[PDB]
Design a protein around this ligand. Structure first.
Ligand SMILES: Oc1cc(NCc2ccccc2)cc(-c2nc(N3CCOCC3)c3occc3n2)c1
Lengths: 980, 278
């Protein structure tokens, strides 16, 4: 709401103006008006009130008031209007402005972008937070020096980076569609103020450089090529086919349209003394006293007893047996007992954590349940072992978590203090107890192997057999002993590192020290493999440090943007606020505005979530401080989305008992107002920052049928060459539902597609844009000319209706290409949905384009989330090809299951299925990185195991292929012709 | 007697089941809890012994060559039952000093026979339908409480911020009184030594209007603090309701799973299982 307790204030509204003489002037003013208007009306009316003699000129003063977030915000920008101020209550205090005005503007702009005031960070007393704020500025100042190094071209590379593929090489089917390795491209040029269009159609090699494309146009340097429609520029000297726009035009078979523009035109647009002791000197077992918990929300009658479950963890792995406290009544939670753990203090590894929870319990049978949970890092960010007494405010248990502890969850106290507060006490030996340096660890590693006591062919083939196991395929104790025994020989096959790391005794400084020395000179590996070592089962700083340096060397900005969702979520598993990964991501975010756009939005989307508000808020501050000119563009997006939140909240809450046309009148009325017209027009699409959103086609904007009230919005493309690419941009805003599952599902579909295209299979998927931007707030891209199956064939109490529509839309000799595209589309989506286990496909879920491209929408739940509330172990098939679909593939044959087209269709599904099976590690790693996200469908490794069962990773390639055939046959009731 | 028993009839042998099914059965179990399953058809070996030690699942593979089973060469044991029953009595320290633990607590596949003693297939099928309906009812009850729990948590957080915003608003209006008090001291003194009660009347009227507005704003903050205590009690009440339903959901699910396990055993048609569940 725009004023606490109200959504929108009406035109007439009173405001209490507090003058600096001491008087209080109640004032009439209109809702639309600005501060300079209100200040004119104030000091005019102030003459009538006493002590107007003492008052100075209107220009001398500035308005001040309290905002929604309890900040004393000063209103320097007097063009802002009353409703956009976000006041707590309608009052304004005039005073003389003081302090650094340059900084106060920027702190407000950063505070508006983040979603909380900067002054809240200033009043944090944790030294790790203030260390981060000062230290992270080193990365920020390093980043801005990179983009200012080769100015002004490197500055243009930041704002308009080359949106390219990872490799210049093309597949066979992509290359073979070209005319002997050449593409016909149209370069447009603007003529005059009259601005009438003329074009120059060229024909040149696919791997030309943007400089060489300009040289050919001047026949028919000093210039740059821009994509018509978008704000996307080919500044870098890549091959022309490597750009995504040109590569997409080759697949789609459309004429690429570029605009010639001056290089000078674009460039002008942008600007007491301590007693320290080593850990390995402490000769003692670990013990942690649990004193008492303040309270817990338990019904005294129903629960029998309560206790404090506890355990020492290295990631997910417990380093020793879990220790419980004695069982005590619910009314008085009090323990005061030293819990003894079977582990030597020196053997505690660097990333060791205390995980604990208060647990309720109910012929000697009982159900144990978590009430609240919390985790603590045993060593703080400065390598200091925790000591003495401390309080821990416990977190609420997430939805569906039946485990008694929560090792994967974030460490640290709950900021909400009105909360169950477990008090505990660690040992105290000296003032400080430090974890040793790497030099001391090297000495113990050499010392350990000294006291201990040819790579054969049978042994060499076992290392390849073990390395081919997927991440969640558990290695055996023989394989652990084998991997450890040949740990020095494992360097020759560096992809085995994750298997070797799990074979280490992490509760043993001997074996950890020897592993540290191997990791120090370990050969680097491909980024997609290194992303495995960033999940919750690899918490050691050295192992993570190695993983980040592999990304620094080999991760392209294409793949960084591709995998950005998982890399942001992985920051939740990090023990400390300052780390190598956050520095790596932040630097890339500040040297590439495409990355920095989504980097902002992925962090911004979870600022409601109090488990990461401080980490993500601090990280956003670093970005918004250093990103420069784009902060202005992001606040326009933020203000636009916040106004769309306000209207949908009114429709959901206030206008719930109203007809849909009455809601449209209200929506159109409020959107017509000037404050909404300014905010919701002339800003970049959050789904794609290259897409400029102009004026609203307000007559064509609509509310959708759902009870949560989504808005089908429609913007003009203000680009002067919009007619070539697209004239309007349609986006679906949604306020009620969680779209993180669709966002992830659509990310995976894009990755699945990219795997198939690189491996020869031309299976065109349609991963439409879907970005979550808040607590169940997100945007969805609208595909043009997309029709559901229900639209082609009307419901009522014929099978061939689908094939008849497709033949009409693609009549003539083009028919065959449309059936091919349809058949290829169905193949990928049949395989994709079976692997991922998405919701059941019906005619409203499935959609088809005019050219014949089939695709899915509304994924929702996935990995078969309804295998809870449904005990079956069978892996269901979501997209079942009914008689309607098989006729389109088989081209009007009645025996559609026994055709050459259906056999050819089956071969694509098998080749597609094995392609994803062979890249199973990637997808398993990607899902493992999302386990801390808070999505109900990805809470534990047991949830990720669904894709192992569908891909059949505990079976042979031929057995897995045989498994796939059986599941299709059972779903199709024999229609899916067996190989026999 | 024991060593002459077949591998099929053994309580701890579970056959073709996934590593996930083993993890569920060994989760939050004591040391020496174990069961044997069929190995992965991708990897070498016949069976996989999965036992508990230090709160971790230790997978030990059982190989075979020429009528002899074991963990590594040389393969000494006659059968899998002889291998297991040996390490039921003797420690695994013999094999590897790391895991000093016996195979103490077998996860029996005749454990469900205790929980579901009734023999008839249609009777167990009907009780699975009944237990599943009680689970679906309690689950929708829990989901509805969790909707309230999150909405109540958010509305408390909205109110909590508004208390600080009220307090900053009161501070500013109290600073306005400090501004009025100090500047009006000298000016009212000029208008009292001179006869100007007309000016005092409309200055003291303005001071009353300020203090009246402070009383109303302090009331609105006072009323909100009662609404915070009201809504904070609803949060604690909803949390209590959820913590009574939580243990019921586990007991209903575990019972439903063991009833579904008993019909997964003695393989029933998937059509019949889906009819009872729905
Ligand atoms: O990724 C998703 C998720 C959901 N979930 C529920 C939802 C969300 C918004 C509005 C209504 C239901 C819905 C859609 C979704 N997408 C649509 N598309 C997107 C692609 O281009 C064509 C239009 C829909 O056209 C008519 C209905 C509808 N629903 C897509």
């Amino acid at each position: 709401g725009e004023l606490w307790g109200i959504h929108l204030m009406p035109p007439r509204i009173l405001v209490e103006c507090l003058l600096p003489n001491g008087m209080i002037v109640t004032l009439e003013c209109l809702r639309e008006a600005t501060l300079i208007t209100i200040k004119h009306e104030l000091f005019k009316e102030a003459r009538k009130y006493p002590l107007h003699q003492l008052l100075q000129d209107e220009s001398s003063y500035i308005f001040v008031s309290v905002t929604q977030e309890a900040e004393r915000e000063e209103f320097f920008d007097e063009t802002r209007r009353l409703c956009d101020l976000r006041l707590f209550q309608p009052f304004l205090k005039v005073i003389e402005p003081v302090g650094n005005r340059e900084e106060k503007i920027l702190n407000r702009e950063i505070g508006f972008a983040i979603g909380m005031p900067v002054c809240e960070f200033d009043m944090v007393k944790d030294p790790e937070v203030q260390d981060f704020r000062r230290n992270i500025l080193n990365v920020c100042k390093e980043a801005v020096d990179l983009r200012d190094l080769n100015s002004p071209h490197s500055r243009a590379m930041y704002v308009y980076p080359p949106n390219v593929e990872s490799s210049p090489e093309l597949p066979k089917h992509i290359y073979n569609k070209l005319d002997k390795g050449q593409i016909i491209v149209v370069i447009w040029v603007i003529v005059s103020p009259n601005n009438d269009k003329q074009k120059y159609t060229l024909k040149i090699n696919h791997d030309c450089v943007p400089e060489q494309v300009i040289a050919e146009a001047i026949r028919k340097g000093k210039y740059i090529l821009k994509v018509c429609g978008c704000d996307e520029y080919f500044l870098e000297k890549y091959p022309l086919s490597q750009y995504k726009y040109i590569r997409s035009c080759i697949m789609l078979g459309r004429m690429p349209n570029l605009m010639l523009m001056a290089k000078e035109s674009l460039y002008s647009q942008l600007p007491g003394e301590t007693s320290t002791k080593s850990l390995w000197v402490i000769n003692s077992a670990l013990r942690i006293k649990i004193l008492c918990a303040t309270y817990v929300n338990v019904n005294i009658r129903d629960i029998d007893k309560i206790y404090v479950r506890t355990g020492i963890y290295h990631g997910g792995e417990p380093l020793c047996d879990n220790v419980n406290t004695q069982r005590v009544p619910c009314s008085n939670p009090r323990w005061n007992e030293w819990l003894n753990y079977d582990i030597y203090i020196p053997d505690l590894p660097r990333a060791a954590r205390l995980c604990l929870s208060i647990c309720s319990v109910k012929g000697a049978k009982e159900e144990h349940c978590p009430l609240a949970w919390g985790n603590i890092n045993l060593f703080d960010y400065t390598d200091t072992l925790v000591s003495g007494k401390m309080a821990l405010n416990l977190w609420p248990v997430p939805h569906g978590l039946e485990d008694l502890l929560n090792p994967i969850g974030v460490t640290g106290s709950n900021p909400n203090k009105e909360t169950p507060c477990l008090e505990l006490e660690f040992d105290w030996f000296s003032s400080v107890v430090k974890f040793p340096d790497m030099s001391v660890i090297e000495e113990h590693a050499n010392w350990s192997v000294s006291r201990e006591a040819e790579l054969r062919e049978n042994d060499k083939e076992q290392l390849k057999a073990i390395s081919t196991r997927d991440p969640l395929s558990e290695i055996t104790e023989q394989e652990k002993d084998f991997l450890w025994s040949h740990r020095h020989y494992c360097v020759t096959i560096p992809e085995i590192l994750p298997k070797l790391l799990l074979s280490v005794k992490w509760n043993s400084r001997d074996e950890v020290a020897q592993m540290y020395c191997l990791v120090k000179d370990w050969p680097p590996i491909k980024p997609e493999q290194a992303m495995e070592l960033l999940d919750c089962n690899y918490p050691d700083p050295m192992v993570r440090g190695f993983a980040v340096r592999c990304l620094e060397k080999y991760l392209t900005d294409d793949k960084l943007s591709q995998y950005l969702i998982q890399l942001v979520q992985v920051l939740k598993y990090e023990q400390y606020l300052d780390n190598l990964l956050v520095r790596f991501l932040l630097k890339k975010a500040l040297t590439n505005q495409r990355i920095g756009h989504f980097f902002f939005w992925h962090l911004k989307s979870e600022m409601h979530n109090k488990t990461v508000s401080q980490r993500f808020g601090l990280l956003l501050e670093s970005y918004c401080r250093a990103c420069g000119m784009y902060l202005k563009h992001l606040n326009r997006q933020v203000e636009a989305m916040e106004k769309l939140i306000n209207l949908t909240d009114i429709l959901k809450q206030e206008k719930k008992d109203e007809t849909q046309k009455v809601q449209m009148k209200f929506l159109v009325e409020q959107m017509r107002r000037p404050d909404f017209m300014d905010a919701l027009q002339g800003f970049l699409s959050p789904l794609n920052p290259a897409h400029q959103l102009g004026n609203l086609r307000l007559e064509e904007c609509r509310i959708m049928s759902s009870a949560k009230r989504p808005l089908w919005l429609n913007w003009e493309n203000p680009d002067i060459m919009s007619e070539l690419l697209f004239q309007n941009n349609e986006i679906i805003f949604k306020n009620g539902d969680d779209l993180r599952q669709d966002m992830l599902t659509l990310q995976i579909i894009r990755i699945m597609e990219n795997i198939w295209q690189n491996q020869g299979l031309d299976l065109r998927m349609l991963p439409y844009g879907c970005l979550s931007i808040g607590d169940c707030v997100g945007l969805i891209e609208v595909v043009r000319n997309s029709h559901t199956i229900m639209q082609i064939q009307c419901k009522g109490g014929n099978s061939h209706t689908l094939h008849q529509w497709l033949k009409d839309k693609n009549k003539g000799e083009i028919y065959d290409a449309a059936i091919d595209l349809f058949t290829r589309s169905c193949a990928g989506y049949c395989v994709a949905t079976f692997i991922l286990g998405i919701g059941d496909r019906h005619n409203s879920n499935i959609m088809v384009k005019d050219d014949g491209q089939l695709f899915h929408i509304d994924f929702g739940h996935f990995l078969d989330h309804k295998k809870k509330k449904f005990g079956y172990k069978r892996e269901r098939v979501p997209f079942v090809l009914t008689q309607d679909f098989l006729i389109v593939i088989s081209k009007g044959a009645q025996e559609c299951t026994k055709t050459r087209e259906f056999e050819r269709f089956q071969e694509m599904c098998y080749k597609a299925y094995l392609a994803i099976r062979q890249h199973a590690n990637l997808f398993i790693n990607l899902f493992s990185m999302m386990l801390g996200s808070g999505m109900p469908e990805l809470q534990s490794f047991d949830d990720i195991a669904y894709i192992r069962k569908t891909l059949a990773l505990d079976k042979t390639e031929q057995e897995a292929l045989e498994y796939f055939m059986k599941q299709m046959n059972d779903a199709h009731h024999g229609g899916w012709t067996t190989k026999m | 007697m024991n060593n002459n028993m077949s591998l099929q009839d053994a309580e701890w042998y579970w056959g073709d089941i996934s590593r996930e099914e083993v993890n569920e059965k060994l989760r939050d179990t004591a040391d020496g809890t174990f069961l044997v399953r069929d190995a992965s058809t991708k990897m070498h070996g016949d069976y996989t012994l999965t036992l508990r030690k230090g709160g971790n699942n230790k997978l030990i593979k059982i190989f075979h060559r020429d009528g002899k089973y074991g963990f590594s060469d040389p393969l000494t044991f006659s059968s899998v039952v002889e291998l297991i029953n040996h390490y039921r009595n003797e420690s695994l320290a013999q094999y590897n000093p790391k895991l000093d633990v016996k195979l103490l607590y077998p996860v029996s596949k005749y454990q469900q026979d205790q929980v579901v003693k009734e023999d008839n297939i249609e009777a167990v099928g009907k009780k699975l339908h009944e237990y599943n309906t009680q689970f679906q009812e309690k689950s929708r009850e829990y989901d509805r409480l969790y909707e309230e729990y999150t909405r109540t948590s958010q509305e408390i957080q909205m109110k909590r911020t508004a208390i600080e915003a009220f307090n900053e608003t009161i501070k500013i209006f109290e600073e306005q009184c400090q501004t009025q008090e100090r500047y009006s001291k000298e000016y009212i003194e000029k208008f009292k030594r001179e006869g100007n009660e007309k000016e005092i009347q409309r200055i003291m009227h303005n001071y009353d209007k300020l203090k009246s507005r402070i009383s109303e704003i302090i009331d609105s903050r006072r009323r909100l603090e009662e609404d915070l205590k009201k809504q904070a009690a609803e949060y604690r009440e909803i949390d209590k309701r959820m913590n009574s339903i939580k243990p019921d959901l586990i007991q209903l699910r575990k019972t439903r799973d063991q009833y579904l396990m008993w019909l997964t055993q003695k393989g029933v048609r998937q059509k019949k299982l889906n009819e009872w569940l729905g």
